[PDB]
Amino acid sequence: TKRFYVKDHRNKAMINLHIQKDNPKIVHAFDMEDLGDKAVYCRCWRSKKFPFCDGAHTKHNEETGDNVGPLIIKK
Amino acid sequence: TKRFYVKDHRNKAMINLHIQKDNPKIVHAFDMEDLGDKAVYCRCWRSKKFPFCDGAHTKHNEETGDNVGPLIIKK
Ligand SMILES: NS(=O)(=O)c1cc(C(=O)O)c(NCc2ccco2)cc1Cl
Ligand SMILES: NS(=O)(=O)c1cc(C(=O)O)c(NCc2ccco2)cc1Cl
Ligand code: FES
Ligand code: FES
């Protein structure tokens, strides 16, 4: 049967679970001029160094089956 | 009682639900030189123009109670 399967539905789960929860919409804005050679930005909301990627996405992806990863601005 | 409350637990929900699901870890990398005056990057995995923000985060935040928003690289 399909009695164990949750049918297709509009998502209700949060993405960010703990970061800056007194801020109603977390936005970051950086000037290119202040960036060094490389900046690696977190898109999974699990990094301890958010907004910078710290490799936490690997645990997120393994535990949930997801496929997210960071955004890189270089040169 | 607390019979309606889901206790604190390690997350199991995905963040990305539909984007590039044949890619096992979605990473984007851009050279500053190719960026114009402003780039607004999606961190919610709902944008129709992912990896660029299209304001979909507003619906995500309203429907789930979350507080995520984009990453801006300017100048
Ligand atoms: N697309 S990938 O697997 O080769 C890749 C993957 C990753 C990754 O971290 O998975 C990455 N992050 C660099 C980093 C991590 C912490 C600080 O900088 C960069 C790249 Cl190019
Ligand atoms: N922190 S905020 O509420 O003032 C803000 C909020 C947003 C926002 O979209 O919520 C934003 N996005 C600009 C955009 C949207 C689509 C293309 O560029 C920029 C800013 Cl500075
Ligand atoms: S730690 Fe979040 S994308 Fe790498
Ligand atoms: S649409 Fe995803 S952060 Fe704006």
Author numbering:
A (entry chain A), B (entry chain A): 31 to 105
Question: What do the paper's sentences say?
Answer:
MitoNEET (gene cisd1) was identified in 2004 as the first example of a mitochondrial outer-membrane iron–sulfur protein, with the cluster binding domain facing the cytosolic side1. This protein was initially discovered as the unintended target for the anti-diabetic peroxisome proliferator-activated receptor gamma (PPAR-γ) agonist pioglitazone, as many of the beneficial effects of pioglitazone, a thiazolidinedione (TZD), could not be explained by PPAR-γ activity alone. MitoNEET assembles as a homodimer, with each subunit containing a rather unusual [2Fe–2S]-type iron–sulfur cluster coordinated by His87 and three cysteine residues2. The amino acids coordinating the [2Fe–2S] cluster form a signature CDGSH domain common to all members of the CISD-gene family.
Here, we present the first crystal structure at 1.95 Å resolution of human mitoNEET with a bound benzoic-sulfonamide-furan ligand, furosemide. We focused on furosemide in this study due to its appropriateness for the X-ray diffraction studies, due to its favorable solubility profile, as opposed to the glitazones where solubility in the crystallization mother liquor is limiting. In the refined structure, furosemide is bound on the face close to the [2Fe–2S] cluster in each monomer, which are critical for the biological function of mitoNEET. The bound ligand was supported by strong density after MR-SAD phasing and refinement, and was further confirmed by simulated annealing OMIT map analysis. The furosemide carboxylic groups are in reach of the [2Fe–2S] coordinating His87 side chain for possible hydrogen bonding with His87Nε. In addition, the furan ring of furosemide can be modeled such that the oxygen is pointed toward Sγ of the Cys83 ligand, although the limited resolution of the refined electron density map cannot discriminate the precise orientation of the furosemide furan ring in the present study. The furosemide-binding site observed in the crystal structure corresponds to previously hypothesized binding pocket, from molecular docking studies performed with the anticancer drug MAD-28 corroborating our finding. In accordance, the Phe82 side chain is within a 5 Å distance from the furosemide furan ring in the refined structure, which could suggest that this is the same binding site that pioglitazone occupies. Considering also the previous report that pioglitazone inhibits cluster release from mitoNEET under oxidative stress, it seems likely that the compounds binding in the furosemide pocket would stabilize the ligation environment of the [2Fe–2S] cluster. The primary binding site identified correlates with the redox-active [2Fe–2S] cluster ligation site, and binding to the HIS87 and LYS55 may inhibit its redox function and/or possible cluster release/breakdown at the cytoplasmic side.
